[PDB]
Amino acid sequence: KTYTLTDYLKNTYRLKLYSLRWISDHEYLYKQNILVFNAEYGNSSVFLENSTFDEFGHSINDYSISPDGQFILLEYNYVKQWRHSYTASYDIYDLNKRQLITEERIPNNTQWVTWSPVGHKLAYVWNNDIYVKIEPNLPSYRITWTGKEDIIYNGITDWVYEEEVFSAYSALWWSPNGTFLAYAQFNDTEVPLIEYSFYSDESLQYPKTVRVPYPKAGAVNPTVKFFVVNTDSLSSVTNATSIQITAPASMLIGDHYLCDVTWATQERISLQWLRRIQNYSVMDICDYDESSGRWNCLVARQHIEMSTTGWVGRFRPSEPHFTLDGNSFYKIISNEEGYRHICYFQIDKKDCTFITKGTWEVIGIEALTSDYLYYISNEYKGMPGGRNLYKIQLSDYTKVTCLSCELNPERCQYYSVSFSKEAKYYQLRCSGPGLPLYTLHSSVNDKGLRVLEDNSALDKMLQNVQMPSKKLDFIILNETKFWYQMILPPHFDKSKKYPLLLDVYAGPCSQKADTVFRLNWATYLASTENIIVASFDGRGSGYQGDKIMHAINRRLGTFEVEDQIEAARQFSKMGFVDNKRIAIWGWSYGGYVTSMVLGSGSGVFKCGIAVAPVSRWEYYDSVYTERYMGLPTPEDNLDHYRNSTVMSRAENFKQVEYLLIHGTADDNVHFQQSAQISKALVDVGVDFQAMWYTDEDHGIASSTAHQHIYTHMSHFIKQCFSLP
Amino acid sequence: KTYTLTDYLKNTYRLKLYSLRWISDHEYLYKQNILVFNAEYGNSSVFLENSTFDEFGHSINDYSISPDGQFILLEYNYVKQWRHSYTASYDIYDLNKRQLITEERIPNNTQWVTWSPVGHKLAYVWNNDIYVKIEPNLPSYRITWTGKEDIIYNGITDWVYEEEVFSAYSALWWSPNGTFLAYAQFNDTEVPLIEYSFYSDESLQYPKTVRVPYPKAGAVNPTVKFFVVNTDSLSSVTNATSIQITAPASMLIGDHYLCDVTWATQERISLQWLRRIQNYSVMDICDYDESSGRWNCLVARQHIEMSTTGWVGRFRPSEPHFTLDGNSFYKIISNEEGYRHICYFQIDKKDCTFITKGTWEVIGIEALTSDYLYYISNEYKGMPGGRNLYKIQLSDYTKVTCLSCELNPERCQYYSVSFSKEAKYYQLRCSGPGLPLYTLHSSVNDKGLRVLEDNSALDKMLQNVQMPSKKLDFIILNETKFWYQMILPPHFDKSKKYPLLLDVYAGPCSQKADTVFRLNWATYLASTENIIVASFDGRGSGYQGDKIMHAINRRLGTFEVEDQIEAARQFSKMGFVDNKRIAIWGWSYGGYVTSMVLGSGSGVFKCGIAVAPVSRWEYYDSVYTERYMGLPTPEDNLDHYRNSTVMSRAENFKQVEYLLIHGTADDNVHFQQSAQISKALVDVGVDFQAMWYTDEDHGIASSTAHQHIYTHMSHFIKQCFSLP
């Protein structure tokens, strides 16, 4: 038997996780019931019995225990908004007392809640305003009063910062001991609103109009102020006083973005600021002043990170990791050869020294001790698609140890890590190319305590299904390696010719050729429909340095699109490809590239599917779009904006079978984008397939919508390829 | 040769029409430049050489000649709004002086302009206000000052009064000699808004949000006041004093409509008002009082029209045609046997005598003189789907000649008529079954003056081509005779098995079975695809008495739906229908029925298309919906509002191939209705074909949109029927 479309849709084969949340340096919480496990021995004491809130009536969506382990935050009434944002109701359960707190409770529709890093102080955001509870039962002090819906965001992010800057709805940053609460403020007054219909339930007679402050490329942007309030001063009588930290003079000269907040010490905070032309960022180090009551960030302590070849950071300037005293940090930066390596910085000195080097990249700093820095990288075997954990010795940058390489080279080449509070322990998560494998390790000597999850359950029932295999490799192109991957059908015969589907993302810093094991739609097409699903990372892709990544700077819709074609050409020359049956499909950026490719008039692709595609960059949001395209003005880049639309390629669609799918409530890539593609294809008499999804958003994540779309796509694909 | 899909979409075979506009009792206008024709002789002159409005420097959309021949109104910058309404620029050109009037020009963005019936007075509506120009070059007196966009409509209808009441934007009515200007004023303050996205040209960055005041079933309706201004007593120093006529007591007691405005004499106007529950109408006849300067409807001249079996009138109460003295009028009302006939009403008495009877119906009173009454009915050969002109003698009700029946019995069976100003002449318009035929006649002796247009050119072209034939016939069912039509493939073979497309409307008072000749998509399918395309007039269809028409009262989505399914069984068992391959398709009400039929679970239909369907009656407009369904309240009819939705029938769709098409900027049947169907099909896991048309409205009528949809639909049918 094979991995059927149903298998994918109704999760017949589950990848078991071992999600843990470290509560201390010794212990971690697990949701078996909620257990406390001891890292040393693996013994567990039932922390919270499953049916304690059976006496509540509400469905508990999430739990959160205060750092001093005295109270638990209960989240219910979950109503999701955007990618990260949501609304919810909350009850604080006193663990000691063994009962809910009733007076001075947390309001309904709280946008964000977070415990201080130590103790049980609690800050939350209601109606765009910030509130602090020093104690779970006492009243909350009102920090901000300027909060106004769709207009002023205090402690939480507006649409664009949520999506494109912080990957988070939260804009609150406690100091390390919780003395201070730092927060951003967003002004959207003049940001214009994307508007679209919400049809809601059948019972709703007149559809509602949704209106989000959304800046499209070139539009007026949200502005940002940054504040820090002393939570160890809050009067029940006098209004809380918030101290502002203004952006650097070199940021105030025009449109900027606050792009990173990181606490250094108890009285030292770091702020990263980006220009709207995202090739220039400045980091401010801000020290608290007792005899001043304010926050100073010396012009001397500023650190610049810039890029002449493109934009700065992968998606934003990398965050710094400060040594206990906060007089030095490390942050990943592009080096002189354009590879992203760790740099040691001294608070007071302009120049850093790179502590790693080579033709590979540091993915992210993971934990920083007094003896050792722990990082993740793709150095092992020169494979950008793999991930290992490395320990680099602080006193000797030569003494580098791979802590996950050898553990299991055969089934494990893509690791993520989770360190306990003090990094005494770490949990390794390999997620390919064998089944995902979760293991616990003690860092003091790096020996492996025990296997947490190994997926024997999955492993067992799998040898029953004719599963597909992955091939990860590279083609040479202009004397450079470009990595690709293929999900190859079971019993792959290379003398037979196969239909190929190119799975595309190919946005900047994209990586679709990796060592991760996945059970998805591609798995089904390979397993059941015998279709090779191939993916390629061309110019513009990430984790291979700047020469590759920056190649599409100011030129979206050029090379990253040309290389998908080139790759598919190179696949055809690989012997096992039926070049009469080659498809391409992609979502968001992939939708865009797919459409760009399908309209290139190359003749390579018989057909394609574009889900939620960007159609022209002036339609997508400012932060992300301008980061690569600059501004759509005659004095900047308007020419290429004009030149890189899927509309302009409409005439070439006469050569292919197109399937265009979009959700009507997509706040992200607005239905507008597919609406203009269709009008384009209509205006030139191109027949194509379409599909809207009523009230689906960019996710198309509704259980039934997801089931509907993949079935629809499967039918289209099967039909493009003459497959009953 | 066949009638290919291209022939249809590119108008290879054009039907020449003969569009004329009478100007006197003996002359008419016709385009070639503008020509005047003398009806007696046929001798032609040139009224306006086209060589006069190229120096104009704007493309002229239409023209209007003043009833006294002195001036011509030019229409440019036509910008279409709803079915009838549009914005446009106007200039006035002197015909005696031969030059464009340069002073006091009609403002840009005029909503409506109209000459007086005699002379050259000019009434026009700009920014929801009414203005009058006695002389074109003179300044214009402003009649109303209450006008405000989307709220107060003076002299023009709102959305719903345009669509369902007056079938016109215009809400002005000049008295027979231009002395008085009667107008309705509409009030929308409280009408909820339909809001939808309009995306516009690709260069539009943020999509626009169209919002129209739109009363959905049971919603808050517009309110109408009525006025009459004396335009001969206007002065440029005092505001025009508008004399209101109030609706009768029986109408003010609840929500009502102004359904008909008709002048009887220089000093007498008949009003028809309708109750929101559209089964009761009152006709007030109002005389002008000479000393007052006010209007007065006597209760002794009220007239009631009501149905017990459903709603009043075919779609609304018929208009009266008054005798020269306005002491008497003729009106199509339904006789006691359920048949719509011409009744002869005396202004003062209550009962009327029916001057026509029979088990057929009168369609429209076309003209009356002192001696005769000219009407169109479906009497000839007992065919509700045929149309002939008849002449009945006012002095002898048994003296009824048929003016058209035997003119050309074979090609001609569906007539319409245009009489000269004083009805000395009339143009006859034959529509089928043969090639259309336009003829001119003098009514004195009822002889044929000349053949105006006989489509010789078209006849020539069709002699090669294998055109389809049309069978018009009926079937007994519950012992009542129900008509249908089949467009049949050329060389039709009663022993072959043809795929059948059922073409539907089937809404209240419909007729999809007539003798009219069409060069449409059904011609393509029959001619080229050898598909039989049939239409059936079931319960609810018009022009066959109230027994058949009122059958669906308060029960939309029942008998008309069921009678369409039975039609299919009936055809299938005639022996020449491949019962495996029967499809159904419709637009608007047609969409709905189709959708309802595909939800039936009857197993008869293999597929269907629904273009711009109603999905749930609570989504459609009040005036149209409540006419057949009453209010959607628990104490009225909410029950059946809820039973007759396509959504609830979604589980059944697993049995059929469904293509669902809808224009995103559809003001009529809102995209909402389709978005809800799609959602329901998703929630029950039914796969289907969908297609949206960006910015297309209810007609999906833009040149390139229209071609795309029929091409698309052709593929869907072509593959559903397994036709290569």
Ligand SMILES: *[C@@H]1O[C@H](CO)[C@@H](O[C@@H]2O[C@H](CO)[C@@H](O)[C@H](O)[C@H]2NC(C)=O)[C@H](O)[C@H]1NC(C)=O
């Ligand atoms: C957010 O920014 C907006 C726009 O810059 C501010 O609104 C302006 O405020 C100034 C001074 O109060 C007024 O003179 C203008 O009338 C306002 N302009 C607009 C466009 O409304 C607003 O003050 C800011 N709000 C906060 C809390 O910072």
Ligand SMILES: *[C@@H]1O[C@H](CO)[C@@H](O[C@@H]2O[C@H](CO)[C@@H](O)[C@H](O)[C@H]2NC(C)=O)[C@H](O)[C@H]1NC(C)=O
């Ligand atoms: C149209 O009707 C509305 C009511 O539907 C009128 O609005 C009312 O106006 C009067 C006088 O100003 C107020 O006393 C009422 O309270 C208003 N009602 C509402 C609901 O607003 C409106 O004035 C009328 N339009 C015109 C100008 O004739």
Ligand SMILES: Cn1cnc2cc(C#N)c(-c3ccccc3Cl)c(CN)c21
């Ligand atoms: C912030 N972020 C995190 N994961 C992301 C994935 C995608 C994609 N595909 C995109 C993206 C790129 C271009 C156009 C539209 C989208 Cl959604 C973004 C950035 N919005 C993402």
Ligand SMILES: Cn1cnc2cc(C#N)c(-c3ccccc3Cl)c(CN)c21
């Ligand atoms: C005013 N008018 C003129 N021709 C019309 C045809 C139809 C149809 N089918 C309808 C109709 C009926 C039900 C649902 C939606 C529509 Cl559009 C109307 C009423 N708008 C029409």
Ligand SMILES: *[C@@H]1O[C@H](CO)[C@@H](O)[C@H](O)[C@H]1NC(C)=O
């Ligand atoms: C685990 O075991 C130790 C000693 O055996 C015990 O003291 C400790 O409380 C346990 N930890 C938990 C919370 O499971």
Ligand SMILES: *[C@@H]1O[C@H](CO)[C@@H](O)[C@H](O)[C@H]1NC(C)=O
């Ligand atoms: C955190 O900083 C505060 C601020 O002055 C200080 O009082 C304290 O030493 C720190 N927290 C503790 C109690 O460890």
Ligand SMILES: *[C@@H]1O[C@H](CO)[C@@H](O)[C@H](O)[C@H]1NC(C)=O
């Ligand atoms: C705090 O400030 C707000 C806004 O200025 C004001 O309305 C409120 O009265 C103040 N409250 C206190 C505690 O003084």
Ligand SMILES: *[C@@H]1O[C@H](CO)[C@@H](O)[C@H](O)[C@H]1NC(C)=O
């Ligand atoms: C038709 O002919 C008559 C005379 O024979 C003439 O008086 C009349 O003007 C003509 N009609 C026109 C304007 O063509």
Ligand SMILES: *[C@@H]1O[C@H](CO)[C@@H](O)[C@H](O)[C@H]1NC(C)=O
């Ligand atoms: C209409 O607008 C055009 C230009 O926008 C102008 O030239 C013309 O005079 C205007 N017409 C009137 C009647 O105001």
Ligand SMILES: *[C@@H]1O[C@H](CO)[C@@H](O)[C@H](O)[C@H]1NC(C)=O
């Ligand atoms: C006419 O009426 C309007 C307000 O209704 C007023 O503004 C205008 O001045 C009036 N003109 C005269 C002459 O009364």
Ligand SMILES: *[C@@H]1O[C@H](CO)[C@@H](O)[C@H](O)[C@H]1NC(C)=O
């Ligand atoms: C039109 O009718 C009015 C009112 O009845 C009358 O006074 C007037 O003389 C008529 N106008 C002409 C000359 O036709």
